[PDB]
Amino acid sequence: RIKKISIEGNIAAGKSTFVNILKQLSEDWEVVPEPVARWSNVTMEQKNGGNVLQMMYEKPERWSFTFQTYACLSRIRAQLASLNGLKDAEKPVLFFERSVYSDRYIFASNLYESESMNETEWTIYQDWHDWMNNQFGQSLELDGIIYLQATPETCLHRIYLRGRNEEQGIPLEYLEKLHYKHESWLLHRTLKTNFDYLQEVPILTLDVNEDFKDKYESLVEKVKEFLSTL
Amino acid sequence: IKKISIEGNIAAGKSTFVNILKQLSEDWEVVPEPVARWSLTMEQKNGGNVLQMMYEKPERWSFTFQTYACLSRIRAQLASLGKLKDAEKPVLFFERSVYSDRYIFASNLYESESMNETEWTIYQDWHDWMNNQFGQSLELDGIIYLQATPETCLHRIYLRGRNEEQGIPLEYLEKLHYKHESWLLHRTLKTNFDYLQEVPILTLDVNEDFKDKYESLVEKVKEFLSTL
Numbered sequence: 001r002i003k004k005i006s007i008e009g010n011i012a013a014g015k016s017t018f019v020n021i022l023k024q025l026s027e028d029w030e031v032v033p034e035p036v037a038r039w040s041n042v043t044m045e046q047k048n049g050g051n052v053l054q055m056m057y058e059k060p061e062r063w064s065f066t067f068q069t070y071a072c073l074s075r076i077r078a079q080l081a082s083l084n085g086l087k088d089a090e091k092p093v094l095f096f097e098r099s100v101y102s103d104r105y106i107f108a109s110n111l112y113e114s115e116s117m118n119e120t121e122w123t124i125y126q127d128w129h130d131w132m133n134n135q136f137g138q139s140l141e142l143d144g145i146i147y148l149q150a151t152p153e154t155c156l157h158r159i160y161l162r163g164r165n166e167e168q169g170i171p172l173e174y175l176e177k178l179h180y181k182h183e184s185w186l187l188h189r190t191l192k193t194n195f196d197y198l199q200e201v202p203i204l205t206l207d208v209n210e211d212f213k214d215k216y217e218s219l220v221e222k223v224k225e226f227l228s229t230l
Numbered sequence: 231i232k233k234i235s236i237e238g239n240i241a242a243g244k245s246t247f248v249n250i251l252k253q254l255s256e257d258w259e260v261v262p263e264p265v266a267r268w269s270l271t272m273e274q275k276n277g278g279n280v281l282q283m284m285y286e287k288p289e290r291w292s293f294t295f296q297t298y299a300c301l302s303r304i305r306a307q308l309a310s311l312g313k314l315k316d317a318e319k320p321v322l323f324f325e326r327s328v329y330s331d332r333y334i335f336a337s338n339l340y341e342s343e344s345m346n347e348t349e350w351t352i353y354q355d356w357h358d359w360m361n362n363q364f365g366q367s368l369e370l371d372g373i374i375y376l377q378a379t380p381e382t383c384l385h386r387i388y389l390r391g392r393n394e395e396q397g398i399p400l401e402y403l404e405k406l407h408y409k410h411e412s413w414l415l416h417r418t419l420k421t422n423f424d425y426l427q428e429v430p431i432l433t434l435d436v437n438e439d440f441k442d443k444y445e446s447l448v449e450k451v452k453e454f455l456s457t458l
């Protein structure tokens with residue numbers, strides 16, 4: 001009964017600006033922020049996260065599997081907690097900052113194709129992912145995906161314009177890898193998956209390349225008309 | 231369905247005690263250890279590879295091994311709890327357990343500096359969640375402790391003649407060995423699953439070879455099951 005709607009987009013695309021924008025417009029609207037976002041900083045799950053995330057930066061081939069499995073286990077559990085945590089709400093909609101699907105099909109597929117996950121590591125990640133998400137049935141199944149499309153140069157700007165010292169090192173090409181994978185999975189709609197319904201699951205695209213903090217009303221209008229189709 | 235775990239050190243006899251035990255009743259079934267099936271499919275092949283990695287670089291693959299194994303155990307005990315549909319007094323014998331994984335090996339890799347604090351507390355955090363969402367009912371109704379000396383096990387690894395095992399050093403079979411005693415005799419260890427503090431335990435000296443001679447061992451097993 002509580003509508004799940006994931007927001008998808010490249011690093012610094014604006015996901016979390018938009019999500020905290022929407023949160024304020026409807027008591028019928030809540031947010032689930034992504035844990036790694038949470039971890040990207042300066043509870044045991046934080047201690048562990050900034051750690052693994054710091055270790056991920058310094059030597060990604062050593063740390064990729066662990067960190068993926070922990071970004072995703074941390075998300076699955078954070079997702080379920082907002083469901084049990086919009087009870088009374090007449091038209092419940094909850095917004096996920098990214099998804100188990102972006103965990104596996106953009107980020108863990110990137111690192112694998114970019115050689116930080118050898119094949120044993122990837123088939124284990126993907127096995128572990130299948131088994132855990134066939135075991136939720138349709139608890140965490142998405143009614144919708146809003147794609148916060150932008151450009152990698154606007155994301156590098158946004159990164160340095162966000163000032164996370166550790167995020168300053170991520171180069172454009174990497175951003176360009178994650179751009180290529182979003183384009184293909186969402187906008188182009190081609191990337192395959194092991195999940196049935198994510199082929200017949202509706203997708204909103206939105207150009208966030210211009211600052212939207214003061215001028216976001218059209219973006220919001222899009223979001224709503226979109227939620228009435230779903 | 232009743233649930234027992236058969237625990238004990240490497241080549242101590244579990245697979246034997248179990249291949250024997252399952253034969254004595256149509257009301258009895260076994261879930262053999264994932265790790266031992268690796269010792270072919272995406273489990274096998276994912277299982278076979280990392281095991282072999284884990285012998286070469288243990289400080290690099292214990293998290294990954296320790297996650298995959300617990301998973302595959304959780305998997306297999308669940309597709310098995312499957313068996314014993316038409317039985318009056320049905321028992322499933324688990325060849326090791328989710329606590330074996332954690333409080334024997336995964337603790338022992340950490341203490342051995344083959345996983346770090348992050349890894350080791352990430353595994354802990356995941357074990358605690360992966361057992362509480364999908365694994366509530368893999369809950370044991372007792373435990374069976376096959377107790378060989380650190381010494382007995384090493385010869386029984388030679389017997390089996392597994393190549394990569396014949397590299398298991400004696401000193402390894404030793405700490406694994408004082409950690410079973412602690413959890414399952416002295417009850418010197420304490421875990422994070424409280425019903426486990428009130429699970430009964432039957433412990434069997436298995437230094438004497440029972441490949442022909444298991445009757446009185448089985449007698450206490452039958453006896454222990456009759457006290458649940």
Ligand SMILES: CCCc1sc(-c2ccc(OC)c(O)c2)nc1CSc1nc(N)cc(N)n1
Pocket residue numbers: 011034036037040056057058060068071072102103104107108116170
């Ligand atoms: C933006 C902080 C998280 C990081 S750090 C990082 C990374 C850093 C340095 C690297 O090489 C120097 C690299 O190959 C990856 N990639 C990432 C993206 S991996 C990822 N991020 C998420 N937010 C979620 C998820 N499931 N996976």
Ligand SMILES: CCCc1sc(-c2ccc(OC)c(O)c2)nc1CSc1nc(N)cc(N)n1
Pocket residue numbers: 240263265284285286287288295296299300330331332335336344
């Ligand atoms: C029995 C084969 C699996 C291995 S391999 C291994 C090992 C091999 C070489 C090592 O040093 C190079 C080492 O420190 C450990 N320990 C083990 C035991 S760790 C373990 N065993 C299980 N049966 C289950 C589980 N979760 N963990």
Ligand SMILES: O=c1ccn([C@@H]2O[C@H](COP(=O)(O)OP(=O)(O)O)[C@@H](O)[C@H]2O)c(=O)[nH]1
Pocket residue numbers: 009010011012013014015016017018037158159161162208210211212213
């Ligand atoms: O219209 C916008 C959207 C975002 N940002 C900035 O872009 C950076 C990244 O935004 P956000 O934290 O949402 O990124 P994400 O959650 O996607 O990493 C932040 O410093 C924002 O202040 C901006 O200036 N204008």
Ligand SMILES: O=c1ccn([C@@H]2O[C@H](COP(=O)(O)OP(=O)(O)O)[C@@H](O)[C@H]2O)c(=O)[nH]1
Pocket residue numbers: 238239240241242243244245246247386387389390438439440441
């Ligand atoms: O009482 C025994 C128990 C075992 N074995 C042999 O020792 C080897 C290893 O034992 P097992 O695999 O059963 O031990 P586990 O690791 O399963 O506890 C096998 O070849 C058995 O045939 C034996 O000769 N006598």
